[PDB]
Amino acid sequence: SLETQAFSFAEEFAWDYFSRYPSDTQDFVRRITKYTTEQLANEMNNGTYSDVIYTSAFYFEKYSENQVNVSVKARVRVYTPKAGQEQDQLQYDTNLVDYYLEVPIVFDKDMNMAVDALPVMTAPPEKAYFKNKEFSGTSENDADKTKKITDSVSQFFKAYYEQNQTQIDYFLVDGADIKGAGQKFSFNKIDRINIYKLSDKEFLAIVDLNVDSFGNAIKQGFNLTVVQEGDKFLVKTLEPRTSNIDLN
Amino acid sequence: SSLETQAFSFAEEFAWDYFSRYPSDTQDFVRRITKYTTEQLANEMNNGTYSDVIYTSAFYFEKYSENQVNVSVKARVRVYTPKAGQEQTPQDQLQYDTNLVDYYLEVPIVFDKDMNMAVDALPVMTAPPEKAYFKNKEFSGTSENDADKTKKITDSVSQFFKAYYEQNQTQIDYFLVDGADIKGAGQKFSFNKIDRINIYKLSDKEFLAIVDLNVDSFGNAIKQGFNLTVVQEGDKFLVKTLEPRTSNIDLN
Amino acid sequence: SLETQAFSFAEEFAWDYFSRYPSDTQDFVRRITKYTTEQLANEMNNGTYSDVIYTSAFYFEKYSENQVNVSVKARVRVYTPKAGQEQTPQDQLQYDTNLVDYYLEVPIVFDKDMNMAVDALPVMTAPPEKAYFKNKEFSGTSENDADKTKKITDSVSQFFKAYYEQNQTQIDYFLVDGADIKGAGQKFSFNKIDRINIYKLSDKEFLAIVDLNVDSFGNAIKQGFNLTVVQEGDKFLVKTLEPRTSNIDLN
């Protein structure tokens, strides 16, 4: 996959692009020449002092039959000289910066890659908007069933968070592939539960709950399809989301 | 593919901020997380945890609807817990232990027509990767056991590996079948020796060598295992293929 | 996607494979057993002291119906004892730091449920190799009219000042209606255009090829773009914005 490999290449390149040492600007040239020509490495260099927290490729554009542009988010520390020092003895302030760098990449017939031009500062990602949609369905109205389903779901979550797969599987429909959270959390309680009847024997439980990790509570939200079988209510599915639900 | 690739990076970026928490200024988390989600969800996700991040790695993709996906992310994190005996100590005076923790976070993502993304619900703790089963199956073939020929193949393979680890491509090429595309390891290791070699005859003048060997990097030995197809040219054996694995081999 | 998943798995594994603490060798076995058998985890262990900066999968090979090989670049620190310490107790050792990029080929097995494991010793492999390219200057016809080149230049300069410094409402004034061109987030100071060559593509449509520089935290950084610019009345509006100042493809 071209995009997959281009993303890793752009991330690697970006790591070096934002790693800069005025204590030796040729170090940048040595490192960057692994990705591009000497001429381009020199053009890209400057007097910045910076190092890297992460690089993450976020957007892909096919530009021609052998060229792509990959936009990369880099979290970086940029060190600026402290005030009143108007080189080897400079004291610095640390600036935490997120950069968005568009990386032009050429590839050959063997999928070897090079950065083929100056990278440029580009637009950050833009958040999607969504209108919340509460579940549209018929609330389960029988109090006996509601309590039974609720206790089953509660016991299931205790096992999901705290117990092994063997113990968990007793709560599940046959072949429901729901693996536990690795016995790494203490289940506190269900904070909110709403139950809907889907069909004669199937129900949706929409659940807000919290668990502890290392002494602090973490909120969680799920929906679960639950199946009535005999005296039992067994878990068929486990999904995140408590609204904007799609059961298809 | 493109949706999954971009969703992976988005979930990893989100997870980095999700697991960076500073209880002295919880608004910092809200500021950062609001880049990905609503200010309401940002506040719902916040807590009193103190943690920072080593890595985030998206490992599983689920398509949920026409415009929603779920991406599971492994985050290696440091969680700071107050040292024992500070139940009565003011928060700003606390001393901390460091806990190294791997978390597995399922991130629900919505996208619009332009493939802009947002986290559309609380992320939840999910199952870790489960190891696949495997069991070694030794290569099934005809062993080559002639003393001198075994000596000759072992010497050719030993010479090839010294080149593969230590020498330039020009030097490596002398040991290869014409046009075999086998590039060396970048001259960054000292080849020590072959520790084990088992040889099988594949056809006239073609053999499989299954090799355990070790090399040095910065004064410590690292074990390596390969299988190589070699072609007999007189006393010399030229390398046709080089692959990892010394069992569960597939020559097709 | 198998490749996408195998890439992530290989990266995670390589992170542990290059994290080694000789005062606690069992720690490596514990961590590596998350990916492979305890026997193979031990076979992979040694007395190295090392930790990890990044891991990045770069190459994928399908090996069989249940096996792949993923090559991973790992940037690592390897700590080597300073001189004179051959007989010094482990816990008193002083170290030098070696910055190293490793290229690790990771053999992975996958099952019908796409669970994965490392099924063999990983091996040191070949680093990536750069693509070579011959630079091609843009092939079109220069626009030479003084008035028109001045107007285009001034419009492009104003556009870039907004692109780097201003909000989208301001940038939109310089764009063809509908152009999908978002600004750089107001985080740079636009300095000047350093080089501009203008070409006529058709009636009232031009390509500007531009070298410029901007400031971030007190230092200048060079940028290169090509932009399609269209005449509307007496104005010139920006229609496209792409990196590259040569090897250009307008299709």
Side-chain angles (χ1 to χ4, degrees), chain A residues 1-37 40-64 66-85 89-125 127-130 132-140 142-143 145-147 149-154 156-173 175-178 180-191 193-196 198-200 203-230 233-248, chain B residues 2-39 41-62 64-65 67-91 93-112 114-136 138-150 152-182 184-187 189-195 197-235 237-252, chain C residues 1-38 40-64 66-86 88-128 130-133 135-143 145-157 159-181 183-194 196-233 235-238 240-251:
Chain A
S1 169
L2 179 51
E3 179 170 349
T4 298
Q5 283 156 53
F7 268 27
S8 284
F9 184 79
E11 284 172 354
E12 296 164 14
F13 166 76
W15 200 285
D16 279 312
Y17 183 86
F18 291 113
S19 289
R20 292 171 187 242
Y21 317 111
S23 69
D24 184 11
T25 69
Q26 287 297 129
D27 188 72
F28 171 92
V29 175
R30 284 193 284 287
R31 288 180 286 103
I32 290 284
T33 292
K34 292 292 203 199
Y35 304 100
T36 193
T37 62
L40 283 165
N42 284 312
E43 289 185 26
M44 288 179 209
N45 208 356
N46 77 354
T48 296
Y49 186 14
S50 63
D51 59 38
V52 177
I53 292 167
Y54 74 69
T55 62
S56 179
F58 71 90
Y59 184 76
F60 181 86
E61 168 201 354
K62 185 79 178 295
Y63 177 74
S64 75
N66 73 338
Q67 292 162 302
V68 301
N69 291 318
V70 171
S71 296
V72 176
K73 174 181 188 194
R75 186 159 290 186
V76 176
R77 290 174 291 252
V78 180
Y79 306 106
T80 47
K82 296 200 170 172
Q85 295 172 119
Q89 293 163 358
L90 289 168
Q91 307 302 294
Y92 294 85
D93 298 309
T94 301
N95 305 267
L96 309 174
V97 187
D98 285 348
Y99 284 119
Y100 301 97
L101 182 72
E102 188 178 3
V103 181
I105 295 163
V106 67
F107 62 92
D108 70 13
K109 66 182 181 59
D110 295 318
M111 291 183 296
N112 301 316
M113 300 171 153
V115 171
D116 64 330
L118 300 175
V120 297
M121 303 300 190
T122 193
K127 259 199 298 193
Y129 164 79
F130 64 96
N132 192 60
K133 298 165 287 305
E134 297 297 326
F135 184 66
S136 70
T138 331
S139 197
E140 172 52 48
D142 178 40
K145 278 194 175 65
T146 298
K147 177 156 199 291
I149 292 155
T150 295
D151 303 338
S152 289
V153 169
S154 176
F156 165 79
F157 278 112
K158 190 174 181 62
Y160 176 82
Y161 283 111
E162 302 180 1
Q163 300 176 17
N164 66 33
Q165 198 57 49
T166 298
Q167 295 168 287
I168 290 169
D169 284 346
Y170 285 95
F171 298 95
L172 310 180
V173 170
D177 175 64
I178 299 165
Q183 311 186 244
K184 285 169 62 229
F185 300 94
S186 306
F187 169 66
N188 299 321
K189 58 182 259 284
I190 295 176
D191 300 308
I193 183 169
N194 296 117
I195 298 153
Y196 305 82
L198 302 176
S199 60
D200 186 52
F203 299 83
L204 192 76
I206 300 185
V207 176
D208 288 284
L209 66 84
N210 68 97
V211 306
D212 250 56
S213 186
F214 294 98
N216 284 285
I218 295 170
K219 286 182 199 315
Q220 310 276 267
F222 293 99
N223 63 93
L224 315 78
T225 295
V226 175
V227 179
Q228 186 176 346
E229 178 165 7
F233 291 90
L234 300 175
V235 174
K236 194 179 152 183
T237 61
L238 178 73
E239 297 288 327
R241 301 181 171 86
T242 56
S243 54
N244 309 304
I245 281 162
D246 186 307
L247 299 180
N248 307 305
Chain B
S2 187
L3 178 54
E4 169 170 359
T5 299
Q6 293 178 344
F8 268 25
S9 285
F10 182 77
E12 289 167 355
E13 294 160 14
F14 165 75
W16 197 286
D17 279 315
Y18 183 86
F19 288 118
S20 302
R21 290 171 190 242
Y22 313 109
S24 64
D25 184 20
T26 61
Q27 278 302 117
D28 187 74
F29 173 92
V30 178
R31 276 197 288 289
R32 287 179 286 102
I33 289 282
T34 289
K35 301 299 252 208
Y36 306 95
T37 193
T38 64
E39 209 162 346
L41 278 167
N43 286 117
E44 287 177 22
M45 291 175 205
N46 210 354
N47 73 358
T49 293
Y50 187 10
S51 55
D52 59 40
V53 179
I54 298 297
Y55 76 64
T56 59
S57 178
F59 67 93
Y60 187 77
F61 177 87
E62 176 205 350
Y64 183 70
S65 78
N67 74 336
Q68 294 159 307
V69 305
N70 291 324
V71 170
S72 301
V73 178
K74 178 183 187 197
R76 179 154 291 179
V77 172
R78 283 177 289 250
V79 183
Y80 302 111
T81 50
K83 296 190 174 178
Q86 293 179 111
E87 286 81 2
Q88 301 173 51
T89 299
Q91 186 167 235
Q93 326 307 297
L94 291 175
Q95 308 296 120
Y96 294 92
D97 297 313
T98 297
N99 305 89
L100 305 173
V101 187
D102 288 344
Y103 282 123
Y104 304 93
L105 185 73
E106 181 175 9
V107 183
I109 297 161
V110 66
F111 60 92
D112 67 14
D114 294 320
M115 302 182 196
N116 300 314
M117 280 171 292
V119 171
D120 68 326
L122 298 176
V124 294
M125 301 300 190
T126 194
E130 175 182 3
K131 281 190 293 185
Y133 173 88
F134 69 96
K135 184 75 188 320
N136 293 332
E138 300 313 302
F139 185 71
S140 75
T142 301
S143 293
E144 179 52 60
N145 294 114
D146 173 85
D148 182 41
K149 180 176 286 207
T150 293
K152 277 167 170 51
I153 294 170
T154 304
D155 295 335
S156 280
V157 174
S158 186
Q159 292 170 18
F160 164 74
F161 277 116
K162 183 178 183 59
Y164 174 83
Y165 284 108
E166 304 184 1
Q167 298 171 16
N168 63 45
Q169 198 59 45
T170 299
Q171 298 172 281
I172 297 163
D173 282 349
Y174 283 104
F175 297 102
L176 304 181
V177 171
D178 299 332
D181 185 26
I182 297 172
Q187 305 182 250
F189 303 90
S190 304
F191 172 65
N192 290 325
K193 56 182 283 211
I194 297 171
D195 295 315
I197 182 167
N198 283 296
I199 303 159
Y200 302 85
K201 193 173 150 80
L202 299 179
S203 52
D204 190 46
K205 302 173 175 50
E206 191 160 301
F207 299 83
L208 184 74
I210 297 182
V211 177
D212 284 300
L213 62 84
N214 70 95
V215 303
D216 251 52
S217 184
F218 297 98
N220 285 100
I222 185 67
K223 296 186 166 322
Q224 311 273 271
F226 296 95
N227 63 95
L228 310 78
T229 303
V230 303
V231 175
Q232 174 163 14
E233 202 162 81
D235 283 350
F237 297 79
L238 301 167
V239 179
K240 190 183 208 312
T241 64
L242 178 68
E243 294 290 335
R245 298 182 168 88
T246 55
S247 63
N248 314 113
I249 284 157
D250 189 325
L251 299 182
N252 313 128
Chain C
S1 158
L2 181 59
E3 178 169 342
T4 296
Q5 196 170 311
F7 268 28
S8 83
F9 184 74
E11 281 165 2
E12 293 156 14
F13 165 80
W15 198 288
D16 280 313
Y17 183 87
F18 290 114
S19 298
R20 299 171 184 240
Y21 317 102
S23 73
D24 190 1
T25 52
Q26 172 92 283
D27 187 67
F28 174 93
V29 180
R30 177 187 60 81
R31 289 179 284 105
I32 290 285
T33 302
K34 297 285 189 190
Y35 310 95
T36 191
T37 64
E38 185 180 84
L40 275 171
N42 279 101
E43 287 186 19
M44 293 175 201
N45 212 359
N46 67 2
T48 297
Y49 189 7
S50 61
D51 60 32
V52 175
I53 291 164
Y54 72 66
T55 57
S56 184
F58 65 91
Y59 186 77
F60 179 83
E61 169 199 349
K62 189 86 166 303
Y63 178 71
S64 77
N66 79 324
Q67 293 156 309
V68 304
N69 289 322
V70 172
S71 303
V72 176
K73 173 178 192 158
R75 179 161 291 183
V76 172
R77 292 174 286 249
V78 181
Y79 303 110
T80 51
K82 295 185 176 183
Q85 297 182 111
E86 282 77 17
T88 296
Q90 155 62 42
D91 67 354
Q92 296 181 50
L93 293 180
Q94 302 307 103
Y95 294 94
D96 292 313
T97 300
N98 301 271
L99 304 179
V100 180
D101 287 340
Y102 280 128
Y103 303 93
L104 185 74
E105 180 173 13
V106 182
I108 300 162
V109 274
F110 63 95
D111 70 13
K112 64 188 168 105
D113 295 318
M114 290 174 315
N115 299 316
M116 284 171 289
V118 174
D119 67 321
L121 295 178
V123 294
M124 300 304 187
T125 195
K130 285 189 282 181
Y132 157 82
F133 63 96
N135 193 51
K136 308 160 287 294
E137 295 298 325
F138 180 72
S139 211
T141 316
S142 290
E143 178 54 63
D145 183 297
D147 168 75
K148 189 165 286 162
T149 60
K150 178 192 193 327
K151 296 188 186 308
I152 295 167
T153 297
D154 291 354
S155 299
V156 172
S157 181
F159 164 72
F160 274 117
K161 193 175 171 61
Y163 175 80
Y164 284 106
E165 305 181 3
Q166 298 165 26
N167 66 41
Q168 196 62 45
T169 300
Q170 297 171 289
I171 295 161
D172 279 355
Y173 283 98
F174 301 102
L175 302 180
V176 178
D177 190 40
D180 194 34
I181 299 168
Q186 307 182 250
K187 40 182 180 286
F188 302 94
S189 173
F190 172 70
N191 292 325
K192 64 177 289 221
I193 293 171
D194 296 305
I196 179 167
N197 292 112
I198 296 156
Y199 303 85
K200 187 168 190 181
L201 300 175
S202 59
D203 189 68
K204 293 162 186 72
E205 181 156 310
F206 301 87
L207 189 69
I209 300 181
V210 178
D211 287 300
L212 63 83
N213 73 93
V214 304
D215 260 37
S216 188
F217 297 98
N219 281 286
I221 57 143
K222 296 181 183 312
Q223 310 273 268
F225 293 96
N226 64 93
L227 310 78
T228 303
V229 170
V230 300
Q231 188 158 0
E232 301 192 358
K235 309 186 169 284
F236 292 82
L237 298 170
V238 175
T240 65
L241 175 77
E242 294 289 333
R244 302 184 171 82
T245 57
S246 55
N247 310 302
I248 282 163
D249 191 331
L250 301 181
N251 306 120

